[PDB]
RNA sequence: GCAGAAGGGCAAAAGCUCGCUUGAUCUUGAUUUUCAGUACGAAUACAGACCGUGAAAGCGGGGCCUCACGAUCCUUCUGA
RNA sequence: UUUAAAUGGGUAAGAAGCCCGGCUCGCUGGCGUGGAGCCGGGGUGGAAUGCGAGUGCCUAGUGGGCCACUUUUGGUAAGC
RNA sequence: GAAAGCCGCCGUGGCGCAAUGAAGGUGAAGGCCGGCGCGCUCGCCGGCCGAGGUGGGAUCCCGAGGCCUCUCCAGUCCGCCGAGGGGCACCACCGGCCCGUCUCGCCCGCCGCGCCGGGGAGGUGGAGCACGAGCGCACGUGUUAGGACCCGAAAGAUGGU
RNA sequence: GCCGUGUCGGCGGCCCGGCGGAUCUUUCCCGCCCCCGGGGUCGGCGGGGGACCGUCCCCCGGACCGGCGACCGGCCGCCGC
RNA sequence: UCAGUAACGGCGAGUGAACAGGGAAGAGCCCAGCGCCGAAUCCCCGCCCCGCGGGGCGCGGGACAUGUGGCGUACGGAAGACCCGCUCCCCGGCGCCGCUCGUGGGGGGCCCAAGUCCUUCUGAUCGAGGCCCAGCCCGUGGACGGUGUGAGGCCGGUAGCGGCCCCCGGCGCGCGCCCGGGUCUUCCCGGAGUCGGGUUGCUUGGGAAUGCAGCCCAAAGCGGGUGGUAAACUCCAUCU
C-alpha cells in the first residue's frame, strides 16, 4: 500500500548492491603515511600553542583548554579532536613511564 | 500605421493636444512610481491596497518543483481516456472497471467537484481530497493510491 | 503620472540599454550556416551514424518530472561491465561513456543494459581487410542504407502501462483513502517527538 | 454644581454625602462623524463571554455630551 | 430672547400596495403569544404638467478666475 | 528565398481551466420521496434526479373571442387578439458551497490507541464556486520607463594641454 | 450518367483495407524474474501479430432533389444566314 | 523558458539570479606523489648515413641531471604475482595513381539570337510589320554603357558549359614504433601559510557575511568540502 509522502516515501524500488568508488576513500590512515607523521612529531616538535595547551590540559583546567583551542583552531568540531589527541599524546608519555 | 493615428489628425492645432495651461512639459509628477507615500498616496491606495510592507515568512531559495501539484477535479476525469471505453465499461455485465491514472497525464491531485456519472471507476493519483474520494466511493468505485 | 485603475510597473530600463542590444537579423543566416556544418559533416565522416552516439536511458530528477524519461549522457561504467565491453573501446565502438555516474537501482539499470546488449547486436563494423577479428560476414550486404537521423535507437520511446480492466474487490474499495495520507503526514513529522517521550520512559526506572 | 474654554443638558437629578465595588475587561462585525464618500481618532447601537450593582426591571464595555491625540519599516513585551 | 414671518429643506401622493386564509421559528413568551418569514387566493384609473429612461467602460482638458443686482465681513474708502 | 511550406514520441514551455493561507497545508452539489435510531433543534438509510429559490425580464408557445356576395355544411390560412405558461442575458435579494480564524459541542476511523487523524453547528475575513471563456494576432487610445514632442542652463565627473 | 444525406447488406479489399484507438487475448510468438538439468502461467515484464469498435473504399438495394452536376431525344416559343 | 519569481532595498525608488526541462554542440585527458626499472632522459658541438624547400634514429666529443631525467601510472583505481583462453599492431614521411558533392580553391581567356522593310528624329533603343508556327534565340527577357525608352549592337547573365596554369584531403614499396583482456591473491594510494576561523573594507539577489582581498590565529585523516537561519549533538547523501 504505497503512498505519496510520509515515512516510506513514493516508489519502493530495489536498492542495487554496488562497490563504493575509489575517490570515496580519500582519508584512511594508510599505515606507511601514519609512520611518516608519527616519525615527524618527535623530530620536528610541536606547535607553540599546543606546548602551552598541554601544560593547561593537566593541571590548570580541563574545559578551558578546549576553549583555548576553540579560539585558536577554528570551531568546536575541530576543537574536540585537538583536545583529545593531545590528551593521548599526553597519555603516550605519562603512562609510558 | 501612421495614417490612422492621432498625430496626423492633430497636425495644425497649435498646442497639439496637451493644453494651453498645463502645457505638457517633461515629468511633472516625478518619474515612475515617484511619491507612492506622499503625494500620490490616494492613487497608490484605493487602487492598490496592500502595497506597503512585509506580510509573510521568508523561504530562502524556494524551488518550483516541490509545490508542484497540477489538479484535476472529477469533471475532467473521463476525458483523459478514450470515450470508446466509458461506453464500453458501462455494458451491463459486471463491475468491469477501467483504471484512470492521472499521473500519466500530468496531474497529481484529484480535487472534489460534483456530478460524476454512474459508472464504477478506479483512479490512480498521488493525492485525494476527502470530497473527491467520496464522490468516487458513491458510484461503486474504488480509490487506489499510488506514487 | 499614475492614473486611474491600472498596473504598478517595474521595467528594467533605468540602466543604459541602448548599447547592449542584440538584434537577431542573422538567425536565418545561422540556420543555413549550421545545416552546412552538419551536411558537410554527415557525409564527411562515414556511414557511421550522425546525431552522435547511442545515448543512455535516464529518468528526470525532480518531483515535477520523475514520471518521464530523458536521454542522458553516457553508460555509467558498470553497463560496460555487465554487457562485457572494455571501457576504452566503447567510445570507438560508438557508445557514449559517462565516467562519474552512479547506479543505485536495478529498475533503471536493466533498461540501459537491455539497450546496450541490443545495440551491439544491431551493429556491424568494418574490417581493415576482411580478416574480421570479431566481425561476421559482409555487413548485411552493404548495410541497406548509409546513415540514420536524430537518434539511433529513438532515445525517448516513453512507454506506459495498460492494466486493461479489473474487478473491485472488498478491501480495495475500503481502505486506501484520505486518512491513508493524513496520518502519513501526522506521523512522519511527529516521528521524533514521540521517540523523545520514548526516551523519557526509561528514566522512570 | 457638573475637574478644567464656552455652548447645551440636569432637581426624589447628570449635583451633594453614603454603601459596595472594577464594564477603564475579552471578542467578531455593521454603522455615524470630516470624507474622495479612504484612514487615524472619536462616537453610536448591537451580538457572544465573564462580572459588578440593585430586592427588582434594569443600568454599566471609562469621564453627561461636543476636543484631549499618530501610519509603513524597526524595537520591545505578551498570547496558543 | 418669550414670540416669530417670506423664501428654503425632508417625506408622502399605491399593485414594490392593500386584504383574507394557511405553515416554519432555536426569537419573544400567562395565552394557536408577539414579530418576522414563506405559500396560495382576491381587485389597476388613484394630484397637476412635461418628457423616453436605465446601466457599464475607458479618458483627454482643468486645478492662477473675475463682474453684476441682492444679503453680508474686514476697511475711512476704493476699479480693494 | 533573411521569404514561404511542414514537424506533434518538437508542447519543452508560456497564459488560462482553482481559490485561500504567513506557513505546514487544505482545496469548491445541493435537491425531491420513502423508511427509520426519545423524528430528539440532533441526526441514519435507499431511490429519483440534479446546478437552488424570489421579483422584474426582450423573445418564443398556448390562447377565450372577433374579423369574408344570403342563411345551415369544412378546410392550410391571415390579422386584432383579452388573459395565462415556459423563461435568455442581466440587475437586486435569500439560501448553499471552498479556504483563513473564533465561539459551542458531541461523534467516528485505525500501517496501530496518541498533548492521533476526520467531522459538526453558529459569526466573520477571501482577488473564490454556483455548467468554464481563454489564448494568439493586428489596430486605435491612454499611462509609465527609455535622450521620449523640439530647444535651453549655474553646475558635477573623469582624462589631458 | 449524376450526387447528397441517413437505412443497411455483400466483412465485400479485413488472413493481398485506410488512418486511429491506456477497447481485447496470462491455450497465440522472443529476452527474463518467482519456485524446486528441466518444468508450474506460477505472477508477469521489454516486444510482435489478430479480434472489436470509431471514422473512410466498390457492389446491389432504398429514399429524396435531378438541384451552379451535365448531355440525350421529343415540345412550345426565339434567333441570325 | 523557469522570471520579472525567490531574494535584496530610507522593505522606498528600484535592483534581481539559479536548479530542473527543451534544443545547438558534443571530447576527453596528463603530471607531481606513492613504489619498480644499473639515467633506460634531454641539450649542444663536429663529422659523415643521406635526400629535397630540411631534419632524422647512426658515431664520438662536450654540458644538464641523482636536490631525480625517461617508461609504466592518476583515484572510474593502479602495480605486482599468478592462472586462463584470444591476438600480433599502428603511424609518420616517400612517390604517385583513383577520387574532390556543389562536384576543393584561385587566376586569366571564350561561349545563343534583327541592325531586315517602312516610319519619326539632333540621334534611335520610338510606333507599326513578319505565310499553316506564328520573324530569331531562349537552361541565355538580371544588368550596364551605347547620341532617348534594347532578350537580340557590344562586355555579360544561364548552363553537373568548355580548354588551360598552379596549388588541395584521403591507394601503394622503403622507415620508425610494437601482448593486449578476464579471474583470484598481496601491495600502493594523493597537491599547506592552503582549507577553516576572527575582524575589517569592496561586491553580489545571497538574506547571522555569495564571491574576493588585507591582517591575525592557524588545521585534520572514519579526514575534509557542501547540503541556502547562527550553535551543539546524531544520522544520511554527495564530491576530492
Ligand atoms: Mg489630450
Ligand atoms: Mg501640460
Ligand atoms: Mg571638475
DSSP A1-29: ---SSSSS-S----B---PPPSTT-----
Chain A contact present for C200, CB below 8 A: no
CA distances from C23 to B53, C12, C20, C29, C57 (A): 40, 18, 10, 13, 38
The C-alpha atoms of residue B34 and residue B40 are separated, in whole angstroms, by 8
- Structural method: cryo-EM
CA distances from A87 to A13, A84, C195 (A): 48, 5, 36
CA B99, B117, B94 angle in degrees (round to 5)?
55
Taking CB atoms and an 8 Å limit, are A3 and B145 in contact across chains?
A: yes
CA distances from C64 to B65, B102, B125, C71 (A): 5, 14, 14, 17
The C-alpha atoms of residue B57 and residue B69 are separated, in whole angstroms, by 22
Q: Which residues of C touch A7 (CB under 8 A)?
A: 184, 187-188, 191
Say which residues have a Cβ less than 8 Å from residue B27's Cβ, sequence separation at least 6.
C1
Chain B contact present for A12, CB below 8 A: no
Beta strands in chain C (DSSP E): 57-59, 69-71
The C-alpha atoms of residue C75 and residue C83 are separated, in whole angstroms, by 11
Contact C57, C108 (CB under 8 A): yes
The C-alpha atoms of residue A71 and residue A56 are separated, in whole angstroms, by 15
Give CA torsion, residues C59, B104, C180, A13, to 10 deg.
-30
**Listed resolution, Å:** 3.9
Contact C1, B30 (CB under 8 A): yes
Round to a whole number and report the distance in Å from the CA of C81 to the C1' of H215. Answer: 54
Question: How remote is the CA of residue B1 from the centroid of ligand 1, in Å?
Answer: 20
Contact A86, A73 (CB under 8 A): no
Do β-strands C69-71 and C57-59 pair in parallel, antiparallel, or remain unpaired?
Answer: antiparallel
Q: Which residues of B touch C161 (CB under 8 A)?
A: 104
Q: Which residues of A touch C102 (CB under 8 A)?
A: 18
The C-alpha atoms of residue C107 and residue C113 are separated, in whole angstroms, by 11
The C-alpha atoms of residue C26 and residue C32 are separated, in whole angstroms, by 10
At C140, list the grid cell.
548485411
CA A27, A31, A33 angle in degrees (round to 5)?
70
**Would residue B13 be called left, alpha or beta, if left means φ above 0 and alpha means ψ between -120 and 50 degrees?**
beta
HEC assignment per residue over A44-89: HCCCCCHHHHHHHCCCCCCCHHHHHHHHHCCCHHHHHHHHHHHHHH
Give φ, ψ of C21 to 5 degrees: -100, 145
The C-alpha atoms of residue C122 and residue C114 are separated, in whole angstroms, by 12
At what angle are helices A76-94 and A64-72 packed, to 10 degrees?
120
First to last CA, chain A: 66
Exposed / middle / buried, residue B120 (Cβ in 10 Å: 0-12, 13-18, 19+): buried
Nearest CB among C105, C180, C185 relative to A15 is that of C105
Contact C110, C57 (CB under 8 A): no
**Cα-trace Rg, chain B:** 29
Give φ, ψ of C97 to 5 degrees: -120, 125
Q: Which residues of A touch C104 (CB under 8 A)?
A: 15-16, 18
Give the sign of the dihedral formed by CA A74, CA A77, CA A83, CA A84: negative
The C-alpha atoms of residue C54 and residue C42 are separated, in whole angstroms, by 16
Exposed / middle / buried, residue A89 (Cβ in 10 Å: 0-12, 13-18, 19+): middle
CA distances from C33 to C26, C93, C149 (A): 10, 30, 19
Three-state secondary-structure class, residue C188: helix
Please state the separation of Cα A39 from the chain's center in Å: 19
Q: Count other C-beta atoms under 10 Å from residue B111's C-beta.
A: 17
Give the residue whose CA sits closest to F109 at C1': C179
Name the DSSP class of B83: H
Please state the separation of Cα B20 from the chain's center in Å: 47
Chain C contact present for A20, CB below 8 A: no
Q: Count other C-beta atoms under 10 Å from residue C95's C-beta.
A: 24
Q: What is the greatest pairwise CA distance in chain C?
A: 86
Give φ, ψ of B83 to 5 degrees: -70, -10
The C-alpha atoms of residue B147 and residue B124 are separated, in whole angstroms, by 8
Check whether residue B18 has its CB closer than 7 Å to nucleic acid strand E.
yes
CA C141, C145, C149 angle in degrees (round to 5)?
145
Closest to B146 in 3D by CA, of B97, B95, B105, B108: B108
For chain H, which bases have at least one atom within 7 A of a protein Cβ? 2-8, 11-22, 24-29, 34-35, 75-77, 87-90, 101-102, 181-182, 188-190, 196-197, 205, 207, 217-224, 228-229, 231-233, 238-240
Please state the separation of Cα C170 from the chain's center in Å: 40
Question: How remote is the CA of residue C7 from the centroid of ligand 2, in Å?
Answer: 23
At B14, list the grid cell.
497649435
Closest to B94 in 3D by CA, of C15, A30, C19, C165: C165
Taking CB atoms and an 8 Å limit, are B145 and A10 in contact across chains?
A: no
Contact B144, B122 (CB under 8 A): yes
Say which residues have a Cβ less than 8 Å from residue B72's Cβ, sequence separation at least 6.
B80, B102, B105, B107, B109, B110, B111
The C-alpha atoms of residue A9 and residue C5 are separated, in whole angstroms, by 48
Helix-, strand-, coil-residue percentages of chain C, each rounded to 5: 30, 5, 65
- Lay out the sheet containing B71-73: strands in order across: B71-73, B109-111, B127-128
Closest to C97 in 3D by CA, of C131, C115, C70, C73: C73
Beta strands in B4-141 (DSSP E): 71-73, 99-101, 109-111, 122-124, 127-128
Write down which residues 95-114 in B have CB closer than 7 A to strand G. 98-101, 104-105
Check whether residue B13 has its CB closer than 7 Å to nucleic acid strand E.
no
Contact B110, B73 (CB under 8 A): yes
Q: Closest approach of chain C CAs to the CA of A22, in angstroms?
A: 11
Q: Closest approach of chain B CAs to the CA of A8, in angstroms?
A: 11
Nearest CB among C2, C6, C167 relative to B40 is that of C2
Do β-strands B109-111 and B71-73 pair in parallel, antiparallel, or remain unpaired?
Answer: parallel
The C-alpha atoms of residue C104 and residue C87 are separated, in whole angstroms, by 20
Amino acid at each position: 500500500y504505497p503512498m505519496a509522502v510520509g515515512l516510506n516515501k513514493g516508489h519502493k524500488v530495489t536498492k542495487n548492491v554496488s562497490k563504493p568508488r575509489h575517490s570515496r576513500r580519500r582519508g584512511r590512515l594508510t599505515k606507511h603515511t601514519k609512520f611518516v607523521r608519527d616519525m615527524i612529531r618527535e623530530v620536528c616538535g610541536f606547535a607553540p600553542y599546543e606546548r602551552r595547551a598541554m601544560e593547561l590540559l593537566k593541571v590548570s583546567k580541563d574545559k578551558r583548554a578546549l576553549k583555548f583551542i576553540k579560539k585558536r583552531v577554528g570551531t568546536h568540531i575541530r576543537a574536540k579532536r585537538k583536545r583529545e589527541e593531545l590528551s593521548n599524546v599526553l597519555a603516550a608519555m605519562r603512562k609510558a613511564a | 500605421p501612421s495614417r490612422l493615428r492621432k498625430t496626423r489628425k492633430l497636425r495644425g492645432h497649435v498646442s497639439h493636444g496637451h493644453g494651453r495651461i498645463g502645457k505638457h512639459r517633461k515629468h511633472p509628477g516625478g518619474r515612475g512610481n515617484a511619491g507612492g507615500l506622499h503625494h500620490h498616496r490616494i492613487n497608490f491606495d484605493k487602487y492598490h491596497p496592500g502595497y506597503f510592507g512585509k506580510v509573510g515568512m521568508k523561504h530562502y531559495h524556494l524551488k518550483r518543483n516541490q509545490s508542484f501539484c497540477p489538479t484535476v477535479n472529477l469533471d475532467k476525469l473521463w476525458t483523459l481516456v478514450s470515450e470508446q471505453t466509458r461506453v464500453n465499461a458501462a455494458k451491463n455485465k459486471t463491475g468491469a472497471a477501467p483504471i484512470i491514472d492521472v499521473v500519466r497525464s500530468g496531474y497529481y491531485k484529484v480535487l472534489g467537484k460534483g456530478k460524476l456519472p454512474k459508472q464504477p471507476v478506479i483512479v490512480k493519483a498521488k493525492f485525494f481530497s476527502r470530497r473527491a474520494e467520496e464522490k468516487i466511493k458513491s458510484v461503486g468505485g474504488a480509490c487506489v493510491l499510488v506514487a | 503620472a499614475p492614473s486611474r485603475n491600472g498596473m504598478v510597473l517595474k521595467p528594467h530600463f533605468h540602466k543604459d540599454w541602448q548599447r547592449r542590444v542584440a538584434t537577431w537579423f542573422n538567425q536565418p543566416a545561422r540556420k543555413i550556416r549550421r545545416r552546412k556544418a552538419r551536411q558537410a559533416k554527415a557525409r564527411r565522416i562515414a556511414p557511421r551514424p550522425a546525431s552522435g552516439p547511442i545515448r543512455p536511458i535516464v529518468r528526470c530528477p525532480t518531483v515535477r518530472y520523475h514520471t518521464k524519461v530523458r536521454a542522458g549522457r553516457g553508460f555509467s561504467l558498470e553497463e560496460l561491465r555487465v554487457a562485457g565491453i572494455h571501457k576504452k573501446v566503447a567510445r570507438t565502438i560508438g557508445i557514449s561513456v559517462d565516467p562519474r555516474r552512479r547506479n543505485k537501482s536495478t529498475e533503471s539499470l536493466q533498461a540501459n543494459v537491455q539497450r546496450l546488449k541490443e545495440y551491439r547486436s544491431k551493429l556491424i563494423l568494418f574490417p581493415r581487410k576482411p580478416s574480421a577479428p570479431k566481425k561476421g560476414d559482409s555487413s548485411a550486404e552493404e548495410l541497406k542504407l548509409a546513415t540514420q537521423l536524430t537518434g539511433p535507437v529513438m532515445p525517448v520511446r516513453n512507454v506506459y502501462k495498460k492494466e486493461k480492466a479489473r474487478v473491485i474487490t472488498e478491501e480495495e474499495k475500503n481502505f486506501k483513502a484520505f486518512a491513508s495520507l493524513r496520518m502519513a503526514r501526522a506521523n512522519a513529522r511527529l516521528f521524533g517527538i514521540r521517540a523523545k517521550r520514548a526516551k523519557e520512559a526509561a528514566e522512570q526506572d
